Design a protein around this ligand. Structure first.
Ligand SMILES: *[C@@H]1O[C@H](CO)[C@@H](O[C@@H]2O[C@H](CO)[C@@H](O)[C@H](O)[C@H]2NC(C)=O)[C@H](O)[C@H]1NC(C)=O
Ligand SMILES: *[C@@H]1O[C@H](CO)[C@@H](O[C@@H]2O[C@H](CO)[C@@H](O)[C@H](O)[C@H]2NC(C)=O)[C@H](O)[C@H]1NC(C)=O
Ligand SMILES: *[C@@H]1O[C@H](CO)[C@@H](O)[C@H](O)[C@H]1NC(C)=O
Ligand SMILES: *[C@@H]1O[C@H](CO)[C@@H](O)[C@H](O)[C@H]1NC(C)=O
Ligand SMILES: *[C@@H]1O[C@H](CO)[C@@H](O)[C@H](O)[C@H]1NC(C)=O
Ligand SMILES: *[C@@H]1O[C@H](CO)[C@@H](O)[C@H](O)[C@H]1NC(C)=O
Ligand SMILES: *[C@@H]1O[C@H](CO)[C@@H](O)[C@H](O)[C@H]1NC(C)=O
Ligand SMILES: *[C@@H]1O[C@H](CO)[C@@H](O)[C@H](O)[C@H]1NC(C)=O
Ligand SMILES: *[C@@H]1O[C@H](CO)[C@@H](O)[C@H](O)[C@H]1NC(C)=O
Ligand SMILES: *[C@@H]1O[C@H](CO)[C@@H](O)[C@H](O)[C@H]1NC(C)=O
Lengths: 164, 49, 219, 46, 46
C-alpha cells in the first residue's frame, strides 16, 4: 500500500483488532468485572460474598481466622461468620429476628379486648412490657400476685380485671 | 385473626398461636476483592506501530 | 530403602474455619503408618492420585519438581523451578533431559532444551512437606515448613499442611520427577488414597490431631 | 379461544407449555398451566 | 459431690434428635443441589 494523506476515504489506512474468545476444556479463566457495594451493618440484608449467599444481619466480631480461611461455620454446619474480600475483616452473621404471635383473649363472651405476645423478640423490633417469653403489648404490669389465669410463661400470667 | 384460625365466631379465654412474624431484608449488598488485573488493553489498542 | 510415616500428610481440605470441634471428612489422604519410599542423593516416578513429598536439609539441593505424562514434547507438562533467586512456575511443551538437573561460577540449568508453545508463565535442619493433587483442571499444592532438630531423617509428630497455590491448567499428569543442585565446587514419596478422617480443630481453628478411621477397630 | 396465525416452519415447537425461544419470549406465550390443543399445518401454497 | 444418668439421657436424646433434624436441610434427596437459590438460578421455572 502506498498510503498518502490526500487519499479518499476507503483508501486510507484502518487499524483492525480481532478478538477471538475460545473455550478449550480447562477449569476457568478471564471474566468480566464483579460489581460491588458498601458495607451495611446491623440491618437484615441480603448479602453475597463471592458466592456465599444468604440473608441476615452482619456485625463485627472477635474471631480470628487463618489467613487462608474465608468463612466460618458452626456445629450443624450453618455459616455464622464470613470474611469480606476487600477489608480483610471477619463479620458475624445473625439470622434476622422471627417468632410466633399469640393473642391473649379474656373470652369473646366477656369482652373484645386482646393482648399480643411476640415470642422471644425484643420489644424494639415491633403498655409495652418485656417478659422472658417475649414482648407483650396491650397488658398492664401490676405488682400483686394472683393465682394463674392464662399462662404466659416463665412465671408470668395474665387476667381480665377491673375492665383491662 | 383468632376467629379465622379457630374457624368460629366465638372464642373462649386462652392464649392462641395465630401467625408467625419475621423481619424483612432492608436492602442487598455484594462484596468481593479489589482489582489488580483489569487487563491493560491500552497496549494492543494503544500501540505506536 | 523404605520407611514408615507415623501421622503425616494432613492438609486443610477446605477454606472453612472451625472452632473447637471434631469434624469428619472424606477425601484423598496419606494413610497413617504407611510405606513411603526413601531416596538418597533421581528417577521418573508415577503420580496416579496425588503425592506426599517431604525433604530435609540446610542447603537447598531440592530445587523443584517436573510433572506431566511424557515429560517431553508432543504433549504439555508443568515445570516448577527455583534458582537461587525465587520460584519459577512454567507451563510449555518442553524437551526434558532424561537426567535433568542444575549445577552450582554457579552456572546451571541443564534441565530442558525446549520451551515451545508456553500456555502459562510465572516468575518473581529443615523439613519441607508438600502435597500435590490435580482435580478438574486445577493443580493444587499444599505445603508446610517445619524445623527439624535432626539433619536428614523423617521425624515423628503432627503438623497440618496449608494450601499454597491453585493453577487452572487443564494439563494431564501421569508422571513426575525431581531436580537437584549438583556438586561442582534425602526425600520420600507417599501416595494418596480415598480415606475418611476425623480432624480435631483448635479454638483458633487449626488442626491439632486426627484419627484415621480405617487403621484398626479402636479407630 | 381460537388463536390463529402463521409462523416460520422451525418454531412450531415454540408453541408449547413452558419454553424459551425468540418466538416464545417475545411474540406469543402460553402458560405452563395450559389446557388445550395446538394444530399446525403447512402453508406456502396460500 | 464426687449418678444422674436418667436425667442426662432425656436431655441427650432430645438434642440428638434436634441435630438430626437440622442436618437434613443439606441433603438432595435426588436433586441438583440442597439450596433453593441454586435451583432458582440455573433452571427455568418449568
Ligand atoms: C483495597 O483497595 C483499597 C484502595 O483501592 C485499599 O484502601 C487503602 O487501605 C489502606 C489501609 O491498609 C489505607 O491506609 C488507605 O488509605 C486506603 N486507600 C484507599 C484509596 O482506600 C485497601 O487496603 C485494599 N484492601 C485489600 C485487602 O486489598
Ligand atoms: C488509549 O489511551 C488513550 C490515552 O490514555 C485513551 O484516550 C482517552 O479516552 C478517554 C475516553 O474517550 C478520554 O476521556 C481521554 O481524554 C483520553 N485520553 C487522553 C489523554 O486524552 C484511550 O481510551 C485508550 N484506548 C483504549 C482502547 O483504552
Ligand atoms: C356467655 O354469654 C351468654 C349469653 O349472654 C351467657 O348466658 C353466659 O352466662 C355467658 N357465659 C359465661 C359468663 O361464662
Ligand atoms: C433488648 O434490647 C435492649 C436495647 O438494646 C437491650 O438493652 C436489652 O438488653 C435487650 N434484651 C432485653 C431482655 O431487654
Ligand atoms: C412495683 O413494685 C416495685 C417495688 O420494687 C416498684 O419499683 C415498681 O415501681 C412497682 N410498679 C408499679 C407499676 O407499681
Ligand atoms: C513396603 O513394601 C515393600 C514391598 O516389597 C516391602 O518389601 C517392605 O517391607 C514394606 N515396608 C514396610 C515398612 O512395610
Ligand atoms: C532464574 O530462573 C528463571 C527461569 O527462566 C529465569 O527467568 C531467571 O532469570 C533466573 N534468575 C536469574 C537471576 O537469572
Ligand atoms: C505447538 O508447537 C508446534 C511446534 O512449534 C506447532 O506446530 C503448533 O502449531 C503449536 N501449537 C499451536 C496450538 O499453535
Ligand atoms: C487425559 O488422558 C485421557 C486418557 O484416557 C484422555 O481421555 C483425556 O481426554 C485427557 N484429558 C484431557 C483434559 O483431555
Ligand atoms: C491460639 O491458641 C492458643 C492456645 O490454643 C491461645 O492461647 C491463643 O490465644 C490463640 N490465639 C493466638 C495465639 O493469637
Amino acid at each position: 500500500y502506498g498510503f498518502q494523506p490526500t487519499n479518499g476515504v476507503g483508501y486510507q489506512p484502518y487499524r483492525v483488532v480481532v478478538l477471538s474468545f475460545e473455550l478449550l476444556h480447562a477449569p476457568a479463566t478471564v471474566c468480566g468485572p464483579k460489581k460491588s457495594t458498601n458495607l451495611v451493618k446491623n440491618k437484615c440484608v441480603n448479602f453475597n460474598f463471592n458466592g456465599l449467599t444468604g440473608t441476615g444481619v452482619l456485625t463485627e466480631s472477635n474471631k480470628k481466622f487463618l489467613p487462608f480461611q474465608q468463612f466460618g461455620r458452626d456445629i450443624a454446619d450453618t455459616t455464622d461468620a464470613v470474611r469480606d474480600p476487600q477489608t480483610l475483616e471477619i463479620l458475624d452473621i445473625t439470622p434476622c429476628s422471627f417468632g410466633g404471635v399469640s393473642v391473649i383473649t379474656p373470652g369473646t363472651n366477656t369482652s373484645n379486648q386482646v393482648a399480643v405476645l411476640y415470642q422471644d423478640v425484643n420489644c424494639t423490633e415491633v403498655n409495652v412490657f418485656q417478659t422472658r417469653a417475649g414482648c407483650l403489648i396491650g397488658a398492664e404490669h401490676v405488682n400483686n400476685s394472683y393465682e394463674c389465669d392464662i399462662p404466659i410463661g416463665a412465671g408470668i400470667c395474665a387476667s381480665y380485671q377491673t375492665q383491662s | 385473626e383468632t376467629k379465622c384460625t379457630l374457624k368460629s365466631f366465638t372464642v373462649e379465654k386462652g392464649i392462641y398461636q395465630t401467625s408467625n412474624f419475621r423481619v424483612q431484608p432492608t436492602e442487598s449488598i455484594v462484596r468481593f476483592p479489589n482489582i489488580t488485573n483489569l487487563c491493560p488493553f491500552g497496549e494492543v489498542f494503544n500501540a505506536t506501530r | 530403602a523404605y520407611t514408615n510415616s507415623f501421622t503425616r500428610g494432613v492438609y486443610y481440605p477446605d477454606k472453612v474455619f472451625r472452632s473447637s470441634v471434631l469434624h469428619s471428612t472424606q477425601d484423598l489422604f496419606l494413610p497413617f503408618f504407611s510405606n513411603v519410599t526413601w531416596f538418597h542423593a533421581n528417577p521418573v516416578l508415577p503420580f496416579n492420585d496425588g503425592v506426599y513429598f517431604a525433604s530435609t536439609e540446610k542447603s537447598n539441593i531440592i530445587r523443584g519438581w517436573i510433572f506431566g505424562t511424557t515429560l517431553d514434547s508432543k504433549t504439555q507438562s508443568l515445570l516448577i523451578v527455583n534458582n537461587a533467586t525465587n520460584v519459577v512456575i512454567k507451563v510449555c511443551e518442553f524437551q526434558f533431559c532424561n537426567d535433568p538437573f542444575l549445577g552450582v561460577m554457579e552456572s546451571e540449568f541443564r534441565v530442558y532444551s525446549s520451551a515451545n508453545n508456553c500456555t502459562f508463565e510465572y516468575v518473581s535442619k529443615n523439613l519441607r512437606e508438600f502435597v500435590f493433587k490435580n482435580i478438574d483442571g486445577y493443580f493444587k499444592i499444599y505445603s508446610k515448613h517445619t524445623p527439624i532438630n535432626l539433619v536428614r531423617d523423617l521425624p515423628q509428630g503432627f503438623s497440618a499442611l496449608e494450601p499454597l497455590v491453585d493453577l487452572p491448567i487443564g494439563i494431564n499428569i501421569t508422571r513426575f520427577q525431581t531436580l537437584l543442585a549438583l556438586h561442582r565446587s534425602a526425600y520420600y514419596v507417599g501416595y494418596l488414597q480415598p480415606r475418611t478422617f476425623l480432624l480435631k480443630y483448635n479454638e483458633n481453628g487449626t488442626i491439632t490431631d486426627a484419627v484415621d478411621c480405617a487403621l484398626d477397630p479402636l479407630s | 379461544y381460537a388463536d390463529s396465525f402463521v409462523i416460520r416452519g422451525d418454531e412450531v415447537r415454540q408453541i408449547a407449555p413452558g419454553q424459551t425461544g425468540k418466538i416464545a419470549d417475545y411474540n406469543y406465550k402460553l402458560p405452563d398451566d395450559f389446557t388445550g390443543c395446538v394444530i399446525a399445518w403447512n402453508s406456502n401454497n396460500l | 459431690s464426687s449418678a444422674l444418668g436418667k436425667l442426662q439421657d432425656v436431655v441427650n436424646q432430645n438434642a440428638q434428635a434436634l441435630n438430626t433434624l437440622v442436618k437434613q436441610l443439606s441433603s438432595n434427596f435426588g436433586a441438583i443441589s440442597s439450596v433453593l437459590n441454586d435451583i432458582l438460578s440455573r433452571l427455568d421455572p418449568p
